[PDB]
PDB file of C-alpha atoms in Angstrom:
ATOM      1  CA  UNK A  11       0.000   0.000   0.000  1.00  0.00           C
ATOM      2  CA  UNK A  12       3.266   2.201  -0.769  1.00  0.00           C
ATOM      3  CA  UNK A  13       3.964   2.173   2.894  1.00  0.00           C
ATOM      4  CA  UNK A  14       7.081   1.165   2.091  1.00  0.00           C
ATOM      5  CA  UNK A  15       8.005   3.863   0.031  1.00  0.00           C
ATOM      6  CA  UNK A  16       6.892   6.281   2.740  1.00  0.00           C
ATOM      7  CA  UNK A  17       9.193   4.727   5.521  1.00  0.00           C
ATOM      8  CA  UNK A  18      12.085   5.715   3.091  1.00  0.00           C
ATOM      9  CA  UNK A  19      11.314   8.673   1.760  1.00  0.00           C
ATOM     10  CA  UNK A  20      10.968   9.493   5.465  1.00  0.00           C
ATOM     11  CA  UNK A  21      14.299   7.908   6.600  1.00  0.00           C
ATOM     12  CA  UNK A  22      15.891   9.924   3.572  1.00  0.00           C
ATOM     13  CA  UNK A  23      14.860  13.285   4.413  1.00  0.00           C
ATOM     14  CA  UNK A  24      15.329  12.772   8.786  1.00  0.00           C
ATOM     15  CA  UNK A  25      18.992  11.299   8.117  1.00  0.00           C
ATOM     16  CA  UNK A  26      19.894  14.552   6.102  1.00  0.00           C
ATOM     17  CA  UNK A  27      19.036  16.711   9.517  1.00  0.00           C
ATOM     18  CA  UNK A  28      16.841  19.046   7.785  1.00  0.00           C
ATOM     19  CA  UNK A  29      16.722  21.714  10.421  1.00  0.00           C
ATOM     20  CA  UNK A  30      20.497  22.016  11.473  1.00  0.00           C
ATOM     21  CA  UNK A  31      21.370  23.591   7.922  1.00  0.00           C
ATOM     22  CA  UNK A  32      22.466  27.336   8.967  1.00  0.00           C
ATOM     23  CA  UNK A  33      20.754  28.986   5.614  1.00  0.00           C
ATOM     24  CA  UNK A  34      17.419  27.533   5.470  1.00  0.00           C
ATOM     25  CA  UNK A  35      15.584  28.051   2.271  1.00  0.00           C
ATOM     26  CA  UNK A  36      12.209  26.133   3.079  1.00  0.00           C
ATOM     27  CA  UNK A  37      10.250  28.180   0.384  1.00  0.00           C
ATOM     28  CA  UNK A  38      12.230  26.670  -2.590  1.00  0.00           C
ATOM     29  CA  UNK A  39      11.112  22.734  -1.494  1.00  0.00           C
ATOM     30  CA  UNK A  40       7.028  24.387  -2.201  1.00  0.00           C
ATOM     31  CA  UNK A  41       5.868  22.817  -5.184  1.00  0.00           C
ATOM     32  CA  UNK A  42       1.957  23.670  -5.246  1.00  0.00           C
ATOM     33  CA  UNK A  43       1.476  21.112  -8.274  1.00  0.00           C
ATOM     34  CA  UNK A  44       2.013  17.973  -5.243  1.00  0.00           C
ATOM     35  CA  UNK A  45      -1.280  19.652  -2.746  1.00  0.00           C
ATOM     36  CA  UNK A  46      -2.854  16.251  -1.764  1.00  0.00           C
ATOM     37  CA  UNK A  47      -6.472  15.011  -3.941  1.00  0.00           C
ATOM     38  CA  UNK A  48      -7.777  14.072  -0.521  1.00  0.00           C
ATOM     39  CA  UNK A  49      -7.687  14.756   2.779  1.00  0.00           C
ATOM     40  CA  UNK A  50      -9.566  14.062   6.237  1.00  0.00           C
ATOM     41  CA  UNK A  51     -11.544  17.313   7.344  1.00  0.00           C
ATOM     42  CA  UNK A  52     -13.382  15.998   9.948  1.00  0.00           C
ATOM     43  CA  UNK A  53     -13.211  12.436  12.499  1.00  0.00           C
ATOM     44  CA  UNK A  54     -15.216  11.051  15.458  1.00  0.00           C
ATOM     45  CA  UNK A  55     -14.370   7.697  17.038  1.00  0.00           C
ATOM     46  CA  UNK A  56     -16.980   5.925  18.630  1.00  0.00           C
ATOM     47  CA  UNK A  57     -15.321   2.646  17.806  1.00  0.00           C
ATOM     48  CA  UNK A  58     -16.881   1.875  21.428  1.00  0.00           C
ATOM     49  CA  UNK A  59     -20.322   0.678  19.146  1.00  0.00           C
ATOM     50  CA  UNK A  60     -19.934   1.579  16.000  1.00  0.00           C
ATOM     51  CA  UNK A  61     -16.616   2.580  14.598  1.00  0.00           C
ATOM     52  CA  UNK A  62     -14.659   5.608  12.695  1.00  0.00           C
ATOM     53  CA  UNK A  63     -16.682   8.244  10.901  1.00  0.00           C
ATOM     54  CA  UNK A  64     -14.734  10.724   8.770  1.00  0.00           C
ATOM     55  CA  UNK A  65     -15.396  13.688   6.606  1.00  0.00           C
ATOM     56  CA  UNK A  66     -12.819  13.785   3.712  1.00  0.00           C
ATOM     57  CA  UNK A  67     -12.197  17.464   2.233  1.00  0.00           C
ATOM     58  CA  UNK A  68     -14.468  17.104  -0.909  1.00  0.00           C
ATOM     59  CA  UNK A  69     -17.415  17.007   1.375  1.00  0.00           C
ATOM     60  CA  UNK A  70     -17.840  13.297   1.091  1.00  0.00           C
ATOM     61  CA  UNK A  71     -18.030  11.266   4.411  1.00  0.00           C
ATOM     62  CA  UNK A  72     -17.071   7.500   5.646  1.00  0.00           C
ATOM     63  CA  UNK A  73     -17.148   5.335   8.011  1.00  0.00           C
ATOM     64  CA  UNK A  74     -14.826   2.121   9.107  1.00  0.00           C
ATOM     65  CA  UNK A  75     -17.208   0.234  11.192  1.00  0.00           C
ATOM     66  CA  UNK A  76     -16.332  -2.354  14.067  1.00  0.00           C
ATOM     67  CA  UNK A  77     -17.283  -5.828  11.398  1.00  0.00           C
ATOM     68  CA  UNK A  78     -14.616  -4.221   9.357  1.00  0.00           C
ATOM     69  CA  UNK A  79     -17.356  -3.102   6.419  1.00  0.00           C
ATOM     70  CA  UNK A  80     -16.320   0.762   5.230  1.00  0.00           C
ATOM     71  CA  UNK A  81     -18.755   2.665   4.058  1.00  0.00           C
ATOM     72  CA  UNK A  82     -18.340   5.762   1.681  1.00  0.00           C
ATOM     73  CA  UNK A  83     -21.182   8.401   1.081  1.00  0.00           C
ATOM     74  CA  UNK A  84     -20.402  10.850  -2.188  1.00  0.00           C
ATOM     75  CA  UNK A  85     -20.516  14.919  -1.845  1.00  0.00           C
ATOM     76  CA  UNK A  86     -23.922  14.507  -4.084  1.00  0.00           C
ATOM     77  CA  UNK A  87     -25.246  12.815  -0.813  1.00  0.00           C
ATOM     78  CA  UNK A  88     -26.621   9.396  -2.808  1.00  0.00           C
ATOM     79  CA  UNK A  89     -23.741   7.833  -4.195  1.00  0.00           C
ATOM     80  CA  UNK A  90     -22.044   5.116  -2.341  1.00  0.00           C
ATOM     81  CA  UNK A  91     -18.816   2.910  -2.474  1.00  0.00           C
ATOM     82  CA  UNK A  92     -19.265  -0.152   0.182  1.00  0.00           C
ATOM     83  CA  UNK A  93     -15.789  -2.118   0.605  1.00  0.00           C
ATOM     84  CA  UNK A  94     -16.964  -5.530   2.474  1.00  0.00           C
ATOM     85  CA  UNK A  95     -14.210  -7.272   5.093  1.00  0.00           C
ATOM     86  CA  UNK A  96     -12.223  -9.256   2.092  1.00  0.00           C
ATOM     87  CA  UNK A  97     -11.751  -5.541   0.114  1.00  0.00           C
ATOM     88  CA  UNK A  98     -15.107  -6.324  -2.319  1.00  0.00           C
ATOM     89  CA  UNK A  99     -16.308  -3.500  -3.223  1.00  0.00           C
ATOM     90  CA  UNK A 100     -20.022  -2.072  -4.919  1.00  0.00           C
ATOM     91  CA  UNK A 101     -20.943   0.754  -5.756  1.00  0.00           C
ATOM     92  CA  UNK A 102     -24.489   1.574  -5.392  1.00  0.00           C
ATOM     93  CA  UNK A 103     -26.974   4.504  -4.398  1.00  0.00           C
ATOM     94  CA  UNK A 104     -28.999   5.504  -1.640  1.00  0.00           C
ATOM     95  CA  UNK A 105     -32.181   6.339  -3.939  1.00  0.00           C
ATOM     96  CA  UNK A 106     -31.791   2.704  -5.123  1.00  0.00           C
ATOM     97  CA  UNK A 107     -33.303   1.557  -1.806  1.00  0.00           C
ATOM     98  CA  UNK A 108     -29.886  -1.210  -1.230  1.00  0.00           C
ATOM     99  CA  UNK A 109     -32.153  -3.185   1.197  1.00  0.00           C
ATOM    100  CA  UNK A 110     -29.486  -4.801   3.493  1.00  0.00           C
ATOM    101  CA  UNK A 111     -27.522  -1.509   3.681  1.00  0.00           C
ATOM    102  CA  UNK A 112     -30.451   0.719   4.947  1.00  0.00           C
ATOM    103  CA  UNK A 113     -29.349   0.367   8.396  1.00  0.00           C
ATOM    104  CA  UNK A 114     -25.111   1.345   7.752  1.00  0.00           C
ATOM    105  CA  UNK A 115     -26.186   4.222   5.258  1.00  0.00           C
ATOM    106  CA  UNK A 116     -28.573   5.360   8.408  1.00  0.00           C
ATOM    107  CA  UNK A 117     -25.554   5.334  11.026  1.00  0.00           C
ATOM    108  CA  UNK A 118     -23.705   7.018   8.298  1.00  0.00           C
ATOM    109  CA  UNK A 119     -26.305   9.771   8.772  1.00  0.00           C
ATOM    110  CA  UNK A 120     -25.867  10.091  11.967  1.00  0.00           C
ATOM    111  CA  UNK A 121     -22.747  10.289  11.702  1.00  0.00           C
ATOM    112  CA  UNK A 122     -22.859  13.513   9.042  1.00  0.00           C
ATOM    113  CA  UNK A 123     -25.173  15.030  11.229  1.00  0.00           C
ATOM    114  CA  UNK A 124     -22.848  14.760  14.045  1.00  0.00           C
ATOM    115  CA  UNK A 125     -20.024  16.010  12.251  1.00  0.00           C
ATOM    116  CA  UNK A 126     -22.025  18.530  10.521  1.00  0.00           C
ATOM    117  CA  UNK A 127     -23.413  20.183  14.322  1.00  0.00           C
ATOM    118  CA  UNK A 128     -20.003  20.278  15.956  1.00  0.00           C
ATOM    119  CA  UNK A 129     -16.922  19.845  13.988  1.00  0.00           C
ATOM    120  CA  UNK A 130     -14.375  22.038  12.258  1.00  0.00           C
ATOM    121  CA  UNK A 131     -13.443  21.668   8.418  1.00  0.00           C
ATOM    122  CA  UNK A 132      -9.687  21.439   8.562  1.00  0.00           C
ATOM    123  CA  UNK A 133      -8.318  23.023   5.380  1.00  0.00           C
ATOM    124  CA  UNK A 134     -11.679  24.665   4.494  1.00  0.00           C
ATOM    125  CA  UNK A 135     -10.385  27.311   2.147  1.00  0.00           C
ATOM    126  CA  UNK A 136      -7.796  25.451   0.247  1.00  0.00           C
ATOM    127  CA  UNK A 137      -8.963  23.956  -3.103  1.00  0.00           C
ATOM    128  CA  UNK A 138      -7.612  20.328  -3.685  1.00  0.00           C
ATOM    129  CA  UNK A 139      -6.000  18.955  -6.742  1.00  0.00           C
ATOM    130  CA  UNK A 140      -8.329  17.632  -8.848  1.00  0.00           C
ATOM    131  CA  UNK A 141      -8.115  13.253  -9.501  1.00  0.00           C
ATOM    132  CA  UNK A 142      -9.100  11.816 -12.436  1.00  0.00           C
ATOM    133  CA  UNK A 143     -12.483  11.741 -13.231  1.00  0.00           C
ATOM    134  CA  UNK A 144     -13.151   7.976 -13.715  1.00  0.00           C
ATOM    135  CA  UNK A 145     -11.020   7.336 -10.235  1.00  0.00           C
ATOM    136  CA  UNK A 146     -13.025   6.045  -7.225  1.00  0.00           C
ATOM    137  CA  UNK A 147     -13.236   7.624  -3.956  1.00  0.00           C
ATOM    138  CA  UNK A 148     -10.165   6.260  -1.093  1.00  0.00           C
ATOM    139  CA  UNK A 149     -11.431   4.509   1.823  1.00  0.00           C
ATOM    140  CA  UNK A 150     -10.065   4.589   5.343  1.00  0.00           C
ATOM    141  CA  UNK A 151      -7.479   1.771   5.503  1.00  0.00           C
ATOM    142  CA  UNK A 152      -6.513   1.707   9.508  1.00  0.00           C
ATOM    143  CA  UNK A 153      -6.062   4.503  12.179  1.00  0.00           C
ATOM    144  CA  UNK A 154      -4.522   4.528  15.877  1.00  0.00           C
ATOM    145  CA  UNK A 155      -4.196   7.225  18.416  1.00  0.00           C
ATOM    146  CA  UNK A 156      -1.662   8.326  20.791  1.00  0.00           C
ATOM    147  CA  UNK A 157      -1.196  10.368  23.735  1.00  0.00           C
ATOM    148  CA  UNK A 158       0.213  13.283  21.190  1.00  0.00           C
ATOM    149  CA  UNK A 159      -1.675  12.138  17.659  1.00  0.00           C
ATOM    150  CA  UNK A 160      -4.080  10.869  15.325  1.00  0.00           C
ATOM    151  CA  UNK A 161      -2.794   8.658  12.565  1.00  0.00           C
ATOM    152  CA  UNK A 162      -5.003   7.988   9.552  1.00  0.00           C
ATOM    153  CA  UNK A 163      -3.966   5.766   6.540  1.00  0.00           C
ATOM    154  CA  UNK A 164      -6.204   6.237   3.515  1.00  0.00           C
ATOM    155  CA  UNK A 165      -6.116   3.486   0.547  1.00  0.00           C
ATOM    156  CA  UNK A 166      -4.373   5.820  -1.812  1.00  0.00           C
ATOM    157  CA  UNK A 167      -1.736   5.379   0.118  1.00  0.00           C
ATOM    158  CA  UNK A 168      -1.405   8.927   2.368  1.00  0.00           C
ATOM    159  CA  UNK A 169      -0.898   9.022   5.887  1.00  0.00           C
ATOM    160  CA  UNK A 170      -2.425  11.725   8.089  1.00  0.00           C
ATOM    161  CA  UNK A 171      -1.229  12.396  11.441  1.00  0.00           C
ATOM    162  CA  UNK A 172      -3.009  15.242  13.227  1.00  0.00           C
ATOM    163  CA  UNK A 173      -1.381  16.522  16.316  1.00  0.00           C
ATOM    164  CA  UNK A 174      -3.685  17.609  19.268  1.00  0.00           C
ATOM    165  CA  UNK A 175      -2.121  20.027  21.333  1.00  0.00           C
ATOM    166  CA  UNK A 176      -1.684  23.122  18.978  1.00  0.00           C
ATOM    167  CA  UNK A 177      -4.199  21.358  15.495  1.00  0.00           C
ATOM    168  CA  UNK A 178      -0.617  21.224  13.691  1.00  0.00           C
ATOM    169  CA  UNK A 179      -1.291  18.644  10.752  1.00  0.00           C
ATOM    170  CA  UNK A 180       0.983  16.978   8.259  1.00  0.00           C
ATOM    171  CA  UNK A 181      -0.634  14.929   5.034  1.00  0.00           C
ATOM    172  CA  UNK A 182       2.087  12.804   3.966  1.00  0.00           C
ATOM    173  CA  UNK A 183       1.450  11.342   0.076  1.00  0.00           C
ATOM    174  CA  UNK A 184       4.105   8.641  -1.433  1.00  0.00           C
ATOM    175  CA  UNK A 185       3.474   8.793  -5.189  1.00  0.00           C
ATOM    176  CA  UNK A 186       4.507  12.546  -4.420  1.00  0.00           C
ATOM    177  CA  UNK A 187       6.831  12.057  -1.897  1.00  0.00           C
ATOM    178  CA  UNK A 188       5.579  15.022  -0.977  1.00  0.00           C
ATOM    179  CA  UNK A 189       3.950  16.394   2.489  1.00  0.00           C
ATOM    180  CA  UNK A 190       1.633  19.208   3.526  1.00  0.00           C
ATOM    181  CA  UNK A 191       1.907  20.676   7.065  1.00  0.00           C
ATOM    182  CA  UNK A 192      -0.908  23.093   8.316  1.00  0.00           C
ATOM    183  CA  UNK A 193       0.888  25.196  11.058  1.00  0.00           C
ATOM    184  CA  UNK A 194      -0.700  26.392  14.033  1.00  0.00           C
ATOM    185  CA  UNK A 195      -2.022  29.578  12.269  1.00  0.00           C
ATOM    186  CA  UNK A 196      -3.947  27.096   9.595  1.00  0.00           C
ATOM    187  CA  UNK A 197      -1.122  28.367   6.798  1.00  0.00           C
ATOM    188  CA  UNK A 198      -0.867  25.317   4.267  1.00  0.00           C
ATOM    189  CA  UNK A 199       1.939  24.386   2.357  1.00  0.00           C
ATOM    190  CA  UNK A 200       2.746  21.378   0.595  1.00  0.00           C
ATOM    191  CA  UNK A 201       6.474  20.374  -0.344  1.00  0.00           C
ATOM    192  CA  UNK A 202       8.737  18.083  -2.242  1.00  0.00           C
ATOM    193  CA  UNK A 203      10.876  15.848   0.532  1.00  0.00           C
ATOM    194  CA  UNK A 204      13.658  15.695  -1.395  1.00  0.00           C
ATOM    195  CA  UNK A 205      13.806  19.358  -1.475  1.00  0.00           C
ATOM    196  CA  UNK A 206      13.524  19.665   1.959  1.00  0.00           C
ATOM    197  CA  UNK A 207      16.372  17.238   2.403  1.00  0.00           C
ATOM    198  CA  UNK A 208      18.451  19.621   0.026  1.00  0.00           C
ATOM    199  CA  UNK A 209      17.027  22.683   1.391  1.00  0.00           C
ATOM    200  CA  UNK A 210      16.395  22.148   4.787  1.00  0.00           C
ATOM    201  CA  UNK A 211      13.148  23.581   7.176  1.00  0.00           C
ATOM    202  CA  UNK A 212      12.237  24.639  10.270  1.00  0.00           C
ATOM    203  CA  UNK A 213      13.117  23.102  13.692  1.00  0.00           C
ATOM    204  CA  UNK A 214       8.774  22.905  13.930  1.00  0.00           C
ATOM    205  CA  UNK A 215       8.457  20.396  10.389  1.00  0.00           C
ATOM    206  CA  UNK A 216      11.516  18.572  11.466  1.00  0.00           C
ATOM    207  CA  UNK A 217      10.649  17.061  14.812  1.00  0.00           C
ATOM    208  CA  UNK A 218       7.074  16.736  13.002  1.00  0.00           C
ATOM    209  CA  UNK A 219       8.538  14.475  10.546  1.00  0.00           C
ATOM    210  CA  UNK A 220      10.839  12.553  13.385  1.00  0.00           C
ATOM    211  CA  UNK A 221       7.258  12.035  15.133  1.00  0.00           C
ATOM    212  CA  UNK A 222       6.371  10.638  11.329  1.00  0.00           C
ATOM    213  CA  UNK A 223       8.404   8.516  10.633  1.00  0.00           C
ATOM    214  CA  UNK A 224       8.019   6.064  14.161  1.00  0.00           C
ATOM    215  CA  UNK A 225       3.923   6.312  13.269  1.00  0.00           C
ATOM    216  CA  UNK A 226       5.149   5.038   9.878  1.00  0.00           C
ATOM    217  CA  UNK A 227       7.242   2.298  10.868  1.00  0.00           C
ATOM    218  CA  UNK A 228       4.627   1.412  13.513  1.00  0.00           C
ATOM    219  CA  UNK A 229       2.124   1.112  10.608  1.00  0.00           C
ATOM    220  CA  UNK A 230       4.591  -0.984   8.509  1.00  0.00           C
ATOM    221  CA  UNK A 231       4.778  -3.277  11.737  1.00  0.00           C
ATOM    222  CA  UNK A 232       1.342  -3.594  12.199  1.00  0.00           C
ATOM    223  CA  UNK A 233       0.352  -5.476   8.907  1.00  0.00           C
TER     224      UNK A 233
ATOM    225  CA  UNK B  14      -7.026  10.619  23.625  1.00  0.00           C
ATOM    226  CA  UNK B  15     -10.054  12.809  22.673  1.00  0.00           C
ATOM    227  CA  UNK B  16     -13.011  11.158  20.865  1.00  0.00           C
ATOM    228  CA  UNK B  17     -13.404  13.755  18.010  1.00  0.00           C
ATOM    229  CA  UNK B  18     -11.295  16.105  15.788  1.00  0.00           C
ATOM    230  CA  UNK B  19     -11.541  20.330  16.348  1.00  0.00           C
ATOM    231  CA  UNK B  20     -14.757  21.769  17.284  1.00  0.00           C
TER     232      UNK B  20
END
């Protein structure tokens, strides 16, 4: 699930100590053309009953439910994508009346309206690249938490880890090798890593990436 | 951990 790729574009860049260059030059590793397709906005865990609703940043929502069943409502609010335990996957619509789905597509409901009420859209006013028009919607691979973070690992292969203390966020993509941080000020900026390895950053979007690169490798371990 | 993201 390019995992692997992400571990070492990780190692790469941390090895090359990023943030003890004298002359940092962070705004020459910016390449605009590498902002992610997707994103998560929005989360709620109430894995207690149910499991892991999400809001991804086109408007569209999930869910990763306890049996292991995902469940993907489109930004038109009737399409659906419904990957079963195995990885099968349909792709159906809520105006189609899918009988034995009424009840998930329901608790994804509730789960929108939830969302909807109380939560923040993180990265609300930055447009994301656009995908290819015949390419399905990602799906919510696996997630953990620690005392610091939220790690999120979509299907396309990005990693989100969202740190709670100060909303810093870093969406890490592998067929880029590229990551976005949002600072603490919501500024978002997306860069090359091998720029940053020649160029260098902050002392902030190093340790961020340190912090990375052990949720990546725990990741890797856990398959 | 909390049980949400940001409100």
């Amino acid at each position: 699930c390019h995992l692997s790729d992400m571990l070492q574009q990780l190692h790469s860049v941390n090895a090359s100590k990023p943030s003890e260059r004298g002359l940092v030059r962070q705004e020459e590793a910016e390449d605009p053309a590498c902002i992610p397709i997707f994103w998560v906005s929005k989360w709620v865990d109430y894995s207690d009953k149910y499991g892991l609703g999400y809001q991804l940043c086109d408007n569209s929502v999930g869910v990763l439910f306890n049996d292991s069943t995902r469940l993907i409502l489109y930004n038109d609010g009737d399409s659906l994508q419904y990957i079963e335990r195995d990885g099968t996957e349909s792709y159906l619509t809520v105006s189609s009346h899918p009988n034995s789905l009424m009840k998930k597509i329901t608790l994804l409901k509730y789960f929108r309206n939830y969302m909807s009420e109380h939560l923040l859209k993180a990265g609300a006013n930055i447009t994301p690249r656009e995908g290819d028009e015949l390419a399905r919607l990602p799906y919510l691979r696996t997630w953990f938490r620690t005392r610091s973070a939220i790690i999120l690992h979509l299907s396309n292969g990005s990693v989100q880890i969202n740190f709670f203390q100060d909303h810093t966020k870093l969406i890490l993509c592998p067929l880029m090798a590229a990551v976005t941080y949002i600072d603490e000020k919501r500024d978002f900026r997306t860069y090359r890593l091998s720029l940053l390895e020649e160029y260098g950053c902050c002392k902030e979007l190093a340790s961020r990436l340190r912090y990375a690169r052990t949720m990546v490798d725990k990741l890797l371990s856990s398959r | 951990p909390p049980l949400h993201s940001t409100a």
